[PDB]
Amino acid sequence: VDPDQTLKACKALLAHIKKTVAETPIWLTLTTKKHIHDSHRLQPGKIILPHPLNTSEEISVCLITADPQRFYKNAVADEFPEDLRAKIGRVIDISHLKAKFKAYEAQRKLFSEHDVFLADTRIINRLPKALGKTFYKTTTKRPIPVVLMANANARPIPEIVAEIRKAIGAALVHLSPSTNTAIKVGYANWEPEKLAANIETVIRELVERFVPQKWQNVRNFYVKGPETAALPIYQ
Amino acid sequence: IKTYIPKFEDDFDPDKHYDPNRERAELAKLKAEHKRERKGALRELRKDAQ
């Protein structure tokens, strides 16, 4: 697959969107040809983008840890003041989440409060039934994996902050048992060269990491906007 | 003492709502008459069913 087709298609698509003011996400729709069965392939992943997805001007992260919440809150009070303490408004363990936040109004207030979410890989299995469907199933604001894994068994704190810096702007990947998925690459206010770079590295990482029996199982990637038509890419 | 003026309607009756805006008063009157007619229709239909 050559990226010149992606560049001409995404330029035509931005012209199609235009002809604040845009503020629409652009994604590519993955199709595969065989059903997906492995529950370890059904795990949500992240793809680190070369141009990060988030603006990081005023957005607030929420960080969901597992075992002692006081240890992780003291690490947040310890480590890094420039980028991290302005963003990390809450550190919630999964026990405190399942305790305090079971109500529809409470999880609606949390979803309206915070801007983007991060969780640990031992918790995102638990999270679609801890956090509500109005948090999880509806929109893109849903937790991204951050590997806080080696008194809690935790990775060392500079690697923790490096992982959170990598994972704030990363692109979330959900897989589904069906054969069609879609994955966001950016917005419509961006430049199409950056868009085509994001689509290229997402194609590389999506196939060669997540879709099993990789380029055998691949089907068409159709670049799409919110309400527009889809443009081909590797039929 | 800073005295104040008692707000009251001169020709008072309990049988009439008081509202400045005729649009809002008329919309509330139409909603009340629609509820009354719907309840009367449901009562007549239920007695005919029994």
Partner: protein, 49 residues
Amino acid sequence: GTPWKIFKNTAFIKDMFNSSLEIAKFEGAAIRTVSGIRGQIKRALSKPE
């Protein structure tokens, strides 16, 4: 029609009538399942018309 919420016996049934006037006409009627379960229309439901 189609069931909407199903309790032990009383089920709420959705895609059959259009208004509470029509339900009040067909109050007490012998409703039936495809399976063979008999039943009776009891009361119109307020919030979904």
